[PDB]
Amino acid sequence: IGMTVEFIPHLFGTNRRPNGSRGWFAYYRMGADVVNPNAFRLLNVETAS
Amino acid sequence: VSSAAVQWSWDAEFEEVSDDSPEFGQPEIPVKKAQGFVPISIEALQDEA
Numbered sequence: 675i676g677m678t679v680e681f682i683p684h685l686f687g688t689n690r691r692p693n694g695s696r697g698w699f700a701y702y703r704m705g706a707d708v709v710n711p712n713a714f715r716l717l718n719v720e721t722a723s
Numbered sequence: 724v725s726s727a728a729v730q731w732s733w734d735a736e737f738e739e740v741s742d743d744s745p746e747f748g749q750p751e752i753p754v755k756k757a758q759g760f761v762p763i764s765i766e767a768l769q770d771e772a
Contacts, residue, residue: 702731
């Protein structure tokens, strides 16, 4: 799914009563991974202590 | 007005979100004056072309 923003008209406080505030909610979904590890070559410059 | 972007985070299912309100700044630009002046005579104004 893409980027979606939803508007929350009413927030609550520690006693389940309105506290005069609102907010914006946004969320996103994605996933990825490598299938074949031998189709790449990566160079590492490691420094000894 | 200047600011920075919000910070997202990867969250699990049914995981409470954390507020990411940004911070704001304000530059200021003063305005100053420069001037120049030159006096002339009547005969100099009438003679020199």
